[PDB]
């Protein structure tokens, strides 16, 4: 019948969907493994960047104290199906809502998510085609656009995803204060006994010219952005596997349910057709009447 | 089944599976000698350097023509595709036999070399509005000719 | 009770082996912990050890068939699960009956390897 | 994996529901009460059956001579109809119930689980697995 064929076609479509999603899983795992090589080569580029910018600070004074623009550069993926990374980044941004907040998100999903939720705190976003390797030029472009968005900005907060392991993708932050505040903190560390761990570093920077210091600042900011985007890409690939596995499980459940419905429907259809035919036959038989028998009844 | 939505990898199993699928296309039944010889040639990798589009033309030249005789290079004594009575010798003696294996390989190697040198080279250099149509018609005709 | 315990242990190990096969197919073999590697090795030995040559196929396969006693199978699998036979090569369990057959095949494989190595050193 | 109080007790309850033969009313209700009041929080999930077997059949308090209850002992099957009469929360059977449960939990955690957590030998692992199999099939 038609309903039986309807379920058959639906099951075939689900099978095609499952095959396509499995191919997507294989492709994503290929890049996960292919760009898994970063793990061996990471965690050593940013060593003096820590001294430049690593500071244990409260989450309130740094926010309320500033009265100039607070730039935020959330990292977001171009394609969906990554998982909860973008949602968590949006939640983190929402928790830090302020009149000084300015957004220059990254990725199509980030743009489409921050444009509607935050129309008056959104200027424009950056997009990279995932064709080449995440390189320094991309980070420089992001930094230049961030400066042009708000040059008199108190800080530039980069929010990205740190890929701790195949199944752990936390949210990490890089804070990049303004040149003036960084200079003040550097001078305080160099002179005062406080910040004893940066004393040598600050004094070394002071001895040099100012152009070199500015170049150092820009260079290490770009390195931090490069690290953020790389970790976000790796987390996206991994995070993407979880979503693809979830989609595969959902598709398998749908296939099982449709197959059960198909079997049940075909059995019911066969039974109904047979019952209808037998009912017609019984109706025909009932109308038949046995006439008088013309036989020699006495001859017995 | 694992490369529907991604660029395929041209490994030996695929390079020969494509030709095998291409060879199964036919309109009329094939004589045993022709079919078995073509399958053997595709099985040993003699069609690795032949494009999937020209497989039918290659098979037609192998069956209904003889490149070695055309260019005066054939050295085989008896194993020629125009000797239709070799079918029963092949049936009695498998292609993987010393009686026929040597000359079979020699003929296949020579035919592949001559084809790649003369025909496919010109095919890849077709740049015109009428030559392209002529080549397309030739390929379609060879598709249903063998 | 021993039969039931051994059977349940074998089933559990096979299920865990399927899970670990999926994991390595996703991540890789080197990502498995020390316990997982041992589980994989034991499960592969079990899978190879469940095969058996039948006496009915002696004419065709050309190798003598084996008739394994019930208690022999229980003891062999119990020993394998614990880890007593962790030194025997994996292929020693392929198409054999009992535990004695495994030992004999392992000895023959070792002798063949030693002879081949000795011949190689000569040339 | 955040394990709150409801999750721990739920897991222990699911473990206790594993049965083969019908359980006497006193044993089942006593085990359920012990699990509900958090006496199995420190007990691992895989040792719940062994803990229940010790509580029902054996008696740690009597074994180590640290028993203080006057009448409330699991070997006194006659207490089933006294528990059924008022409750397990009655002032008559509540103090001794809590005392024996606390003593049993303390002795178990001190003696049995501590040793079970220090088993590495392959033979001892097999022995522990056999013990758990036997307990799961008998209370
Ligand atoms: O007028 C000036 C004074 C100083 N400087 C710059 O200030 C820095 C003082 O640097 P130092 O005086 O502490 O070190 P140095 O002798 O090893 O200098 P280099 O060879 O490494 O450069 C040097 O980098 C110097 O070039 C100027 O560029 N212009």
Swiss-Prot record, chain B:
<comment type="function">
    <text>Mitochondrial membrane ATP synthase (F(1)F(o) ATP synthase) produces ATP from ADP in the presence of a proton gradient across the membrane which is generated by electron transport complexes of the respiratory chain. F-type ATPases consist of two structural domains, F(1) - containing the extramembraneous catalytic core, and F(o) - containing the membrane proton channel, linked together by a central stalk and a peripheral stalk. During catalysis, ATP synthesis in the catalytic domain of F(1) is coupled via a rotary mechanism of the central stalk subunits to proton translocation.</text>
</comment>
<comment type="similarity">
    <text>Belongs to the ATPase alpha/beta chains family.</text>
</comment>
<feature type="binding site">
    <location>
        <position position="26"/>
    </location>
    <ligand>
        <name>ATP</name>
    </ligand>
</feature>
<comment type="subunit">
    <text>F-type ATPases have 2 components, F(1) - the catalytic core - and F(o) - the membrane proton channel. F(1) has five subunits: alpha(3), beta(3), gamma(1), delta(1), epsilon(1), plus the additional subunit P18 (Tb427.05.1710) that is not present in F(1)F(o) ATP synthase from metazoa. Subunit P18 (Tb927.5.1710) interacts with the alpha subunit with a 1:1 stoichiometry; the interaction is direct. Subunit gamma is part of the central stalk. F(o) has three main subunits: a, b and c.</text>
</comment>
<protein>
    <recommendedName>
        <fullName>ATP synthase subunit alpha, mitochondrial</fullName>
    </recommendedName>
</protein>
UniProtKB/Swiss-Prot annotation, chain C:
<comment type="function">
    <text>Mitochondrial membrane ATP synthase (F(1)F(o) ATP synthase) produces ATP from ADP in the presence of a proton gradient across the membrane which is generated by electron transport complexes of the respiratory chain. F-type ATPases consist of two structural domains, F(1) - containing the extramembraneous catalytic core, and F(o) - containing the membrane proton channel, linked together by a central stalk and a peripheral stalk. During catalysis, ATP synthesis in the catalytic domain of F(1) is coupled via a rotary mechanism of the central stalk subunits to proton translocation.</text>
</comment>
<comment type="similarity">
    <text>Belongs to the ATPase alpha/beta chains family.</text>
</comment>
<protein>
    <recommendedName>
        <fullName>ATP synthase subunit beta, mitochondrial</fullName>
    </recommendedName>
</protein>
<comment type="subunit">
    <text>F-type ATPases have 2 components, F(1) - the catalytic core - and F(o) - the membrane proton channel. F(1) has five subunits: alpha(3), beta(3), gamma(1), delta(1), epsilon(1), plus the additional subunit P18 (Tb427.05.1710) that is not present in F(1)F(o) ATP synthase from metazoa. Subunit P18 (Tb927.5.1710) interacts with the alpha subunit with a 1:1 stoichiometry; the interaction is direct. Subunit gamma is part of the central stalk. F(o) has three main subunits: a, b and c.</text>
</comment>
């Amino acid at each position: 019948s038609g309903k039986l064929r309807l379920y058959k076609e639906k099951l075939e479509g689900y099978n095609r969907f499952y095959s396509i999603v499995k191919t997507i899983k294989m492709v994503t795992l290929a890049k996960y493994r292919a760009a898994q090589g970063r793990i061996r080569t990471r965690d050593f580029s940013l060593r003096y960047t820590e001294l430049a910018f690593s500071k244990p600070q409260a989450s309130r004074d740094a926010v309320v104290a500033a009265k100039n623009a607070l730039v935020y550069i959330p990292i977001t993926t171009n394609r969906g199906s990554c998982g909860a990374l973008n949602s968590n980044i949006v939640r983190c941004i929402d928790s830090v809502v302020s009149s000084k907040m300015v957004l220059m998100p990254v990725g199509k999903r980030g743009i489409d998510s921050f444009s509607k939720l935050y129309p008056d705190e959104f200027r424009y976003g950056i997009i990279n085609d995932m064709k080449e390797s995440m390189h320094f030029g991309y980070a420089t472009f992001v930094i230049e656009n961030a400066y042009e968005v708000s040059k008199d900005a108190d800080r530039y907060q980069v929010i990205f995803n740190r890929f701790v392991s195949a199944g752990v993708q936390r949210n990490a932050v890089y804070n990049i204060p303004s040149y003036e505040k960084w200079k003040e903190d550097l001078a305080d560390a160099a002179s005062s006994d406080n910040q004893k761990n940066r004393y040598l570093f600050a004094n070394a920077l002071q001895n040099e010219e100012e152009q070199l210091i500015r170049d150092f600042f820009d260079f290490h900011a770009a390195l931090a952005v490069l690290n953020a985007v790389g970790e976000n890409e790796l987390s996206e690939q991994a995070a993407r596997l979880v979503a693809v596995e979830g989609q595969l499980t959902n598709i398998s459940s749908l296939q099982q349910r449709t197959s059960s419905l198909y079997n049940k429907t075909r059995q019911f259809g066969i039974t109904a057709a047979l019952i209808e035919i037998l009912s017609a036959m019984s109706s025909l038989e009932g109308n038949a009447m046995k006439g008088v028998r013309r036989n020699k009844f006495w001859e017995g | 089944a694992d490369s529907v939505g991604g660029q395929q990898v041209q490994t030996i199993p695929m390079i020969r599976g494509a030709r095998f699928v291409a060879l199964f296309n036919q309109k009329q039944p094939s004589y045993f000698m022709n079919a078995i010889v073509s399958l053997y040639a595709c099985l040993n990798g003699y069609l690795d350097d032949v494009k999937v589009q020209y497989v039918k033309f290659y098979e037609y030249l192998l069956v209904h023509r003889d490149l070695g005789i055309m260019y005066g290079t054939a050295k085989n004594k008896f194993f020629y595709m125009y000797v239709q009575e070799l079918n029963y010798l092949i049936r009695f003696f498998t292609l993987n036999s010393p009686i026929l294996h040597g000359e079979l390989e020699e003929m296949l190697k020579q035919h592949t070399h001559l084809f790649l040198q003369h025909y496919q080279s010109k095919m890849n250099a077709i740049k015109s509005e009428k030559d392209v149509k002529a080549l397309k018609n030739l390929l379609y005709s060879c598709k249903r000719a063998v | 009770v021993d039969h039931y315990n051994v059977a349940q242990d074998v089933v559990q190990m096979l299920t865990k082996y399927r899970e670990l096969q999926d994991i390595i197919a996703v991540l890789g073999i080197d990502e498995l912990s020390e316990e997982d590697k041992l589980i994989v090795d034991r499960a592969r030995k079990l899978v190879k050890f469940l095969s058996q040559p039948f006496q009915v196929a002696e004419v065709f396969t050309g190798m003598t068939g084996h008739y394994v006693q019930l208690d022999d199978t229980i003891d062999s699998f119990s020993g394998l699960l614990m880890g007593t036979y962790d030194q025997v090569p994996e292929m020693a369990f392929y198409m054999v009956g009992g535990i004695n057959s495994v030992l004999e095949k392992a000895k023959k494989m070792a002798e063949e390897a030693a002879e081949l190595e000795k011949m190689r050193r000569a040339r």
